[PDB]
Symmetry: C4
Subunit: 257 residues, 4 copies
């Protein structure tokens, strides 16, 4: 039960525990939010056809160079430097080092920083590279550190795991059912847009969610009846656990007041 | 209502009354769930153009043979064998089989095994083959034996028969009304995409459910006004009994907790 | 209310007003419902290209002949005869002829029976004919006499006129606003799909109701931003009075039970 | 606050502020509403190719001529004259000019009239003219002075700024997430319809709102999985703060009685 005796990490953590307490903490929070937003904007803009063409050493999406002529690389490195500085500052100033991984927002940053170390280690299947370049985008969720609403969203999704699982399960059941029905209904037609049941999965999903795309549509009377049933059942299926998820969100949203 | 008096039938009833009794029961349940999922995956994959096209012969979709060279047929036979074994095991314990079929879950399995007897009978008057090949898909509903959420869905649909019937009735009324209106609105146009009122039923259902496909759309001012009314009335009609169905689902969902 | 006191009209009123009173009344009600359904089916099937082509073919809308070889004409005449018989039978039991225009259910029947007989009478200044040809479809609402659910729908719409009018007003405001915005956003484009604001009304309606057709879509950045705002505002606008209308429907639906 | 004490401005204020006070006030209110509707109709009709071509008449929005012989320009000037007369009449009824920071009606009016003053100044370099022609559309919101329902809408939007901001934030997060996912999923295809992430923003918005256009759709298995997730998450995200906004609307709707 003895005190830590460091007298500096605890002081910094107490100072940065209430960002509204002092001006410098609010300035730092604003700088962090602006840097996150700048990183998001740069990430989105890097994929434009004007810049992407004029950028393994090619499948990784970036080429390391000392000169760093690409402005997008410079901005990415600057944002990575700021993120690393913030992570180290919070890691060296947390009084509860053993329970440092209790905050989810820290796990998000550690997950975002793992791929760089993994790449460095493995440098000395193929879907891993695609999924890792995909997982790069999730520095968006680092906005949950400053946004209270996104924290309420996270708590709602954590407390509504069973209901969301039921939603996914009901959608899956209905999708297979109606895809099978519409594939067999329009099976004896050469103009049919449903070559197979897995292909009809896409139509079943875009009809059950009532999105409606028109890329694949029924053409037979039986196919159209199955499509009508698919739309009705999709409404009836989505509407069941959404109220429970909404009640959870309302609870975690009004819990503050 | 005399008791069996055998002194062992009560023991079997007690043993089969508590599925959670032992670990081997959990293992058997897991094996059954995996077998159902494997059967669903195999059934969905059987229809891919890679296997079906590159193997009467088209009306049935499968050829029964003693050799059983097709891997999909092998998996189908294995799953059918497991289902038959489970059904026989659960049926060999019922003294009064006459009232045994009060549960819908056993009717689902007897329906899933109907295709075997139908094929046997027809091996030794056209809709029967297509309907049997389609009813082959309802082995999904045998997942309701293991899933509590799908049981709550079944209870909700049982207790919401009147409200679902009202939904269907209101949808039918609005569909005919607006299909007639949009057919007569765009009747004096040779470029119209509504050849007849039954052909406009498809547009009415995909607009009233607010799915929206674009394959058939109005082109005249009157047709567009009718389409606007169709969308508004479809929202207003779907939204009426969905809250009652949702209340029923919430009741049967919080009853278990 | 009070009984007629005539001692003979009351018997016929109880016979033709309460189907549950006696078996013959139930049979008559079933016959009436089936006749309405047959009339609806015949009306829908008459417009099919197989039959409509092979029927003053525009001013009257039907060919009168003594032989009446057309099955659709025979069915229409039989249904009209039955409707006229029912209307006369029920009108012979109404003492208050002056207050006959008070019940909306009888006004619906008289309006649905006006077209054919009034056209025949005037056969032996132009919009009236179109109005009559449109109103011929409205015998569907004669099912509200036998269906309690459609009566609850009618009561809900009658008691929710203000909120439904607010819904229409909000949709009109949003439609004009977003159609103007999307027309001016993509005004300086030759490939633009919005020639004018009234032409963009259709897109605004199908986006606000979140139906989504794709026949007319934005192509500019400003047009796409306006479309995003249109979809969001459409959800936010439809969702406001629908709960009130649903509360009214639930009240009038649980009032009977 | 305190009355002007002039004994004349009060009479005009009561005439032009309380339509229910007297018959002439109701007549004036009806005339104003009809004038706003006529102006809206004329503004919408001005953009039709029938009139706009047969009148730059598009960049400035008006035809400058000494004769001013066009009757439609006369109608527009008459509507502007009536609006100016109403504005002057109500401006002559404000006693305390120093208390400008207390009434929100004066702030709204001054903010709305500043662009009119800029237009007057510039009457006697490209985006300004387009934005002024677009801001001309906001006479639609002048109907809020007479409509109570649109006042309730305004109060609901003013009291639900936090929930609407959360809705926009969640939509933005999901849009960027799923646009990135669908761009990277369908990146290794020559026929891909997602050249870049900002281009996939439109698809993410029209899928998450469940509108569904079909102009740009996924074609790969990964793209289709991402689209399914996009639709589900869009429903789950839109449905969260809409109940709070609806509760606010219901509160401000029933607060009147």
């Amino acid at each position: 039960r003895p005190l830590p005796e460091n007298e500096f990490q605890r002081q910094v953590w107490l100072l940065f525990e209430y960002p509204e307490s002092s001006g410098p903490a609010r300035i730092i929070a604003i700088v962090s939010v602006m840097v996150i937003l700048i990183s998001i904007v740069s990430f989105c803009l890097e994929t434009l056809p004007i810049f992407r063409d004029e950028n393994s050493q090619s499948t990784i999406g970036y080429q390391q160079s000392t000169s760093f002529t690409d402005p997008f690389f410079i901005v990415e490195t600057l944002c990575i430097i700021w993120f690393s500085f913030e992570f180290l500052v919070r890691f060296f100033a947390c009084p509860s080092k053993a329970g440092f991984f209790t905050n989810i927002m820290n796990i998000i940053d550690i997950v975002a920083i793992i791929p760089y170390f993994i790449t460095l280690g493995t440098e000395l299947s193929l879907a891993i590279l695609r999924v890792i370049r995909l997982v790069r985008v999730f520095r968006i969720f680092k906005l949950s550190r400053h946004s209270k609403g996104l924290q309420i969203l996270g708590q709602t999704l954590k407390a509504s795991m069973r209901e969301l699982g039921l939603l996914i399960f009901f959608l899956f059941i209905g999708v297979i059912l109606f895809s099978s029905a519409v594939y067999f209904a329009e099976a004896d037609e050469r103009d049919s847009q449903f070559p197979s049941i897995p292909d009809a999965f896409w139509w079943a999903v875009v009809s059950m969610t009532t999105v409606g795309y028109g890329d694949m549509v029924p053409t037979t009377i039986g196919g159209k009846i199955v499509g009508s049933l698919c739309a009705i059942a999709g409404v009836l299926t989505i509407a069941l656990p959404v109220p429970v998820i909404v009640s959870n969100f309302n609870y975690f949203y009004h819990r503050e007041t």
